[PDB]
Structures are given as structure tokens and as C-alpha cells.
Amino acid sequence: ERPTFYRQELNKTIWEVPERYQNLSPVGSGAYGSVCAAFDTKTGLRVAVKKLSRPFQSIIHAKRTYRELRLLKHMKHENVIGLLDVFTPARSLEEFNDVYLVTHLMGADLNNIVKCQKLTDDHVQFLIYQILRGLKYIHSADIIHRDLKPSNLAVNEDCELKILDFGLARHTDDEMTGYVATRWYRAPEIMLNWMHYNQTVDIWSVGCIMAELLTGRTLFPGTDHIDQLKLILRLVGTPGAELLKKISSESARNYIQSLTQMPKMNFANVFIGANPLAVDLLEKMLVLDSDKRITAAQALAHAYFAQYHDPDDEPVADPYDQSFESRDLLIDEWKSLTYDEVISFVPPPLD
Ligand SMILES: Oc1ccccc1Cl
Numbered sequence: 001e002r003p004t005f006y007r008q009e010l011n012k013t014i015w016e017v018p019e020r021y022q023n024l025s026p027v028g029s030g031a032y033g034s035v036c037a038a039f040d041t042k043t044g045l046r047v048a049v050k051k052l053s054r055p056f057q058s059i060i061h062a063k064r065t066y067r068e069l070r071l072l073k074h075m076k077h078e079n080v081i082g083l084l085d086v087f088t089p090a091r092s093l094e095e096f097n098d099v100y101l102v103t104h105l106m107g108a109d110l111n112n113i114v115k116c117q118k119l120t121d122d123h124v125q126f127l128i129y130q131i132l133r134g135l136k137y138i139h140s141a142d143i144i145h146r147d148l149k150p151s152n153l154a155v156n157e158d159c160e161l162k163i164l165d166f167g168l169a170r171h172t173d174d175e176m177t178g179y180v181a182t183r184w185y186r187a188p189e190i191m192l193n194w195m196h197y198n199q200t201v202d203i204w205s206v207g208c209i210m211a212e213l214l215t216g217r218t219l220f221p222g223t224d225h226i227d228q229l230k231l232i233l234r235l236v237g238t239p240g241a242e243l244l245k246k247i248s249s250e251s252a253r254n255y256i257q258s259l260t261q262m263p264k265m266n267f268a269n270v271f272i273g274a275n276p277l278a279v280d281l282l283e284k285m286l287v288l289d290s291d292k293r294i295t296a297a298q299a300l301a302h303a304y305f306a307q308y309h310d311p312d313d314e315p316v317a318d319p320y321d322q323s324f325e326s327r328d329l330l331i332d333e334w335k336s337l338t339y340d341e342v343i344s345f346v347p348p349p350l351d
Contacts, residue, residue: 005089010036013051016089017100021049031165037105040084043350046105047084055099055338062334065099066324068168069341072101074141074320076348079134081164086345093339106154106162113155114212121275123159124213129300129308130161131206136296138163139199140316147171148205149185150212179223185209188232189290191225194252200293207285214274230259236288237264243289277304 003018010026013034017024024036032053040047055065072083085102110127113119119127131153138145146167154162176183187204189195211219219235222228238261239247247253267279281304284294294302300309329337 002091010034015049015051016098017049018087021047021102024049040102043084045084047102048105050101050103052099052101056097056331056335059329059331059334062331062338063324063329064169066334066338066341068166069099069101069338070324071143071166071168072103073341073345074317075138077134077137077315077317079130079162080137081162082348083345085347086342088339088342093336096335096339099338099342104162106164107157108155109151109164110153110155110161110209110213111150114150114216119213121214121278124210124278125305126159126308127155127161127213128206128210129305131163131209132296132299132305133314134161134163135202135206136300136314137317139202139296141318141320142199142322143320144199145202145205148202148209149181150209151181153209177224179221181218183225183228184218184220184222187290188229188288191229192252194249195247198290200290200295203285203293203296203299204290206299207282210278210282210285211271214271214278233259233288234262235265235267235270236286238262239288246289246291275304277302280304 003020005016005018007014007016008024009015010024011029011034013029015024015034015036017038020042021038021040024038027035027037027048029035033050034053035048035050038047038049039045052065054061056062069086072081073086075082081103083101083103085100087100087102088096088098090096090098131148135145135148143166145163147165148163152164154164171182176186183191185205185208187197187201190197190201208219220228220231222231238259239256244253244256247256267283268274268276271279271282281294281299281302284302285299287293297314299305300314301311324337
């Protein structure tokens with residue numbers, strides 16, 4: 001039952017893959033892992049094959065490997081990335097070192113859609129509808145994506161959308177620093193490690209993305225964390241008394257209280273020309289108090305999506321057992337857990 005593998009070196013990396021994958025072409029490397037595009041002869045699909053870099057190099061990296069695999073094996077939804085395959089060339093746990101993941105090859109992401117194309121309001125409705133449908137699913141499993149931004153959303157020629165890679169390993173400090181797209185969609189409460197936070201951080205991200213689709217420009221293109229905060233508070237207003245209570249870092253409170261009080265702006269005067277319903281939705285997403293932000297299931301029922309909303313076709317997820325997150329194991333234990341997950345993988349049907 002084990003398939004036959006063949007080897008080849010591409011840009012100083014050995015790839016050993018099942019024969020079913022053909023015409024491997026390097027596509028990139030850095031998000032630690034090399035990625036090749038290939039043709040999968042068994043499904044007829046163009047696929048991206050990611051070879052993980054040093055998956056069990058430390059406890060941290062081994063747990064991260066486990067976490068990514070568990071998450072990708074769970075996601076089964078039209079608007080979310082899933083796993084077509086996962087494999088290793090090893091024939092036993094004792095020689096298990098390398099892990100390859102396989103998913104659908106995506107073309108365009110939303111960034112180059114917003115940069116290269118004029119979207120109508122109908123396109124904005126459809127794109128945002130699909131992000132919220134996918135996010136309803138994700139959140140119903142008690143998973144937080146954490147890294148929703150246009151480059152993480154694949155969009156095909158029919159404007160059909162998929163949410164791609166989850167924020168799994170926290171980004172390094174340096175890659176969130178300065179004038180960088182990496183931070184522009186992040187919710188204020190997690191911009192610094194200064195509050196604990198919920199699923200609705202992803203809803204803030206969606207509001208930022210929706211605003212950019214509507215204007216064609218970044219809503220909060222901050223030059224650093226503090227510049228970005230000031231852009232945010234200028235739009236949504238400074239926190240009142242109700243909300244300053246709920247903040248618990250004293251140092252955060254203390255900086256926040258140094259700021260001059262600003263009222264919430266009028267969104268109809270920021271988003272000139274936009275559908276009044278879109279503006280209404282944005283006001284419900286872009287709220288500082290994260291307890292009061294609209295949820296994805298709530299947002300799907302908003303009147304802006306009246307032409308796409310179907311309550312019998314917005315599925316929720318099977319339960320996702322995340323108890324491993326609180327568990328402490330050695331490298332070889334994490335690794336053996338990963339091996340069982342590779343070995344038990346069962347592919348999606350061609351129907
Ligand atoms: O980003 C991913 C995820 C799973 C498989 C392949 C790639 Cl490139």
C-alpha cells in the first residue's frame with residue numbers, strides 16, 4: 001500500500017515524493033518549509049507541496065509541527081484551506097524525519113485582486129460573505145485564525161474565496177515592526193501583548209479588509225504600533241469609562257489615559273459613496289470593545305448579505321480537541337504523535 005517515491009534535488013533541497021506528484025517546480029522558501037507546485041495525477045489537481053524545515057528540531061518546533069498538522073487535518077469547508085495529502089518517505093518511526101503537506105495550488109490572493117481590479121459592491125458583498133462563512137466554521141471549533149489579511153485569502157476567477165494559513169507560530173517581533181502589512185489588520189487589543197483576547201480579533205481583521213475592498217486602500221497603514229493605534233483611535237474614538245475598566249494591564253491603561261479624548265467619527269463621511277448597509281456593518285465590526293463586536297454568525301444575518309445568506313448552507317465544524325495545547329511532552333513524544341497523524345490520514349473523496 002505504501003507508494004513508490006522518487007528523489008530529485010531542486011535548489012539544493014532533496015524532494016522525495018510519491019510518483020503521483022509530477023512536474024515539481026520550486027515556488028518559494030522561508031515560511032520555514034520549501035514549497036513546490038506540482039501536478040497530482042491521482043486527482044487531476046495542481047497542488048502545492050510543502051516540505052517542512054526541521055520539524056522536530058526542538059520541543060517548540062515539534063509541537064508546532066503537531067499543531068499545524070492537527071489543524072490542517074480538521075478543516076473541512078469550502079472557504080477554508082484543507083489537506084489533500086500528507087506523507088513521509090520514512091518506513092518506520094525510527095527513520096521518521098521529514099514531513100510533506102499537500103494542498104490545492106492557489107493563483108491570486110485578495111491583495112492582487114484589490115490592487116489590480118475595480119470591484120463592485122456586489123463583489124464586496126460576495127467576498128466578505130465568504131470570509132464570514134469560513135470564519136463562522138473556524139470559530140465554531142474554538143479556533144482563532146489570528147492572521148487574516150489579503151495575502152492570506154485566495155480568490156479565483158469566479159471571485160470564489162478561501163482562507164489560507166493560520167497564525168500558528170507567533171510572528172517574530174521584527175516582522176511586526178514598522179510600515180508593514182503584517183500588522184495593519186491586527187486588532188488593537190493584541191497589537192501589543194497587553195490584553196487577553198477572543199475570536200473577535202478576527203472580526204476586526206475582516207472590517208479592515210472590507211474597508212480596503214470598498215476604498216481600494218489600507219484603512220490603518222501605520223508606520224509603527226503607536227502610529228497605528230493613533231490612526232485607529234482617530235476613527236473609532238478613544239475608550240470611555242465602561243471600557244477602560246475592562247482593561248487590566250496597568251501600563252496599557254496608563255498610556256491610554258495619556259491620550260487626548262477623541263469622539264468616534266462619522267463613517268459615512270470616511271467611506272464616501274459606499275452602500276449605507278456596508279457602512280452599518282463596518283460600524284459593528286470596528287468597535288474597540290471586543291465584547292460588543294459583531295460575531296461571524298451574527299454578521300452573516302446582516303441585511304448587507306441578503307442576496308447570499310442561506311442559513312441552511314453555513315455549516316459549523318466538528319468538535320476540535322485542543323487539549324494538547326496545555327500538555328508538556330519531549331521531542332520524540334510530539335514526533336511520535338505527528339507520525340500517528342501522518343499515518344492515519346485519510347484523503348477527501350473525489351465527490
Ligand atoms: O500552506 C500550505 C499548507 C498545506 C500544504 C501546503 C502548503 Cl504550501
